[PDB]
Amino acid sequence: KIEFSEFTVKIKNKNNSNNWADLGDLVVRKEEDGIETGLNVGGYTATFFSLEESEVNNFIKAMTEGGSFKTSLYYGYKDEQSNANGIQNKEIITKIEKIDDFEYITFLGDKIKSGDKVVEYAILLEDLKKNLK
């Protein structure tokens, strides 16, 4: 069923001016149990979030159609509260958006070390489509 191993995708994110700015690479990878994502930005390298097996299919769906999946441990980018120590069992919820009549999966992150100011991220739908499918 599950055809892939490690791949890498660009990931944008709304900037403090609320404007999708190119952020870095999202290294996606498959491990015996679940999935581990990692964020590289030319630098910063770290685990982004990760996932257990039972949420793998919900991930593949969410990351190509839009749904939601449950991370076993989310860290996010350095802005985010969660970056310090992470949180377990975080539900990511994705939907699709056009950026330039070019579709993007687009999901939220974590409160910013602000009161809501939750960060949003976007990856080009096609890229996830072509590795997750």
UniProtKB/TrEMBL annotation:
<dbReference type="GO" id="GO:0016020">
    <property type="term" value="C:membrane"/>
</dbReference>
<keyword id="KW-0614">Plasmid</keyword>
<protein>
    <submittedName>
        <fullName>ErpC</fullName>
    </submittedName>
</protein>
